[PDB]
Amino acid sequence: TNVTGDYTDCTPLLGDRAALDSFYEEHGYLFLRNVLDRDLVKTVAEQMREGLVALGAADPHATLEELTIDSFESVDEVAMHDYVKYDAFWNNPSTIKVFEQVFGEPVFVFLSTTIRYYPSQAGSEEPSFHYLTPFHQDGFYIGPNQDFRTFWIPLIRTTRESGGVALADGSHRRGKRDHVLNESFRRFGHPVRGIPPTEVSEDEHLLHSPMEPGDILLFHAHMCHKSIPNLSKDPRLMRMSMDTRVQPAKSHRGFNAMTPWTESA
Numbered sequence: 001t002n003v004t005g006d007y008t009d010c011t012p013l014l015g016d017r018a019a020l021d022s023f024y025e026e027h028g029y030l031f032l033r034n035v036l037d038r039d040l041v042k043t044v045a046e047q048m049r050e051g052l053v054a055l056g057a058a059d060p061h062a063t064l065e066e067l068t069i070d071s072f073e074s075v076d077e078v079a080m081h082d083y084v085k086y087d088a089f090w091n092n093p094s095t096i097k098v099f100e101q102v103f104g105e106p107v108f109v110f111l112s113t114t115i116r117y118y119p120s121q122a123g124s125e126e127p128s129f130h131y132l133t134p135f136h137q138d139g140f141y142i143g144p145n146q147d148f149r150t151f152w153i154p155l156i157r158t159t160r161e162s163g164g165v166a167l168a169d170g171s172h173r174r175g176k177r178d179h180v181l182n183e184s185f186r187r188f189g190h191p192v193r194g195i196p197p198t199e200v201s202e203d204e205h206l207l208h209s210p211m212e213p214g215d216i217l218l219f220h221a222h223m224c225h226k227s228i229p230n231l232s233k234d235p236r237l238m239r240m241s242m243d244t245r246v247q248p249a250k251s252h253r254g255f256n257a258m259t260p261w262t263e264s265a
């Protein structure tokens with residue numbers, strides 16, 4: 001594995017503005033544990049699950065940790081957006097409170113959210129991982145302002161093997177990097193660009209840790225990050241997550257900020 005380490009637990013920094021900001025400036029991320037309402041997260045996980053029962057041929061009697069689907073790509077993603085009530089989650093006062101704690105000022109939550117529901121492909125000789133994200137920076141796609149941050153949450157727990165998002169520690173300090181076409185990644189059948197290996201340094205140590213529902217991972221617009229494939233076996237688990245962007249309420253609201261996923265995709 002290219003993952004060389006865990007996220008640093010930034011939870012101890014929360015009531016110390018200077019320390020929280022210092023870590024974020026150096027590293028380009030914060031990992032905050034048990035800060036969201038677990039009951040709210042569970043309701044969203046259940047919404048995703050019921051969407052999959054309706055749209056992905058998921059077992060109607062499976063618990064969240066028994067749940068699986070044959071194929072991510074066979075599920076109607078537009079229709080899944082009707083099931084997962086993310087705006088109500090992000091804009092719940094308890095969630096907003098955490099966003100404000102991070103930014104130190106009132107926030108605006110993007111009207112776009114990406115939802116992810118990836119089955120394990122452990123054992124597959126020809127796995128379908130082309131729909132995952134290669135190394136990229138969100139600020140390459142989203143702007144013009146570059147002071148938004150991405151907020152990434154697990155809807156059920158992740159393990160090292162079930163995957164999530166890998167962060168290249170401190171890779172947000174030399175601006176936007178080149179993203180080039182990569183034949184091993186596709187989205188809705190179309191080509192995808194990613195940062196090539198000649199542009200992510202061995203010094204920008206790759207990080208991934210298991211996370212629990214209630215936890216959040218957030219990162220700078222120039223943080224270089226990529227998907228980690230689900231190869232869970234023991235236990236085999238879906239990886240269920242969602243990600244949005246948040247910015248100061250005072251900042252310019254661009255296309256991405258104002259446009260729901262279904263209207264832009």
Ligand SMILES: O=C(O)CCC(=O)C(=O)O
Binds near residue numbers: 138226227244
């Ligand atoms: O979770 C993933 O696989 C990719 C996440 C991502 O690119 C993001 O949150 O910006």
Ligand SMILES: [Fe+3]
Binds near residue numbers: 137138
């Ligand atoms: Fe991203």
Ligand SMILES: [Mg+2]
Binds near residue numbers: 059061
């Ligand atoms: Mg049964």
Ligand SMILES: [Mg+2]
Binds near residue numbers: 172222
């Ligand atoms: Mg810079």
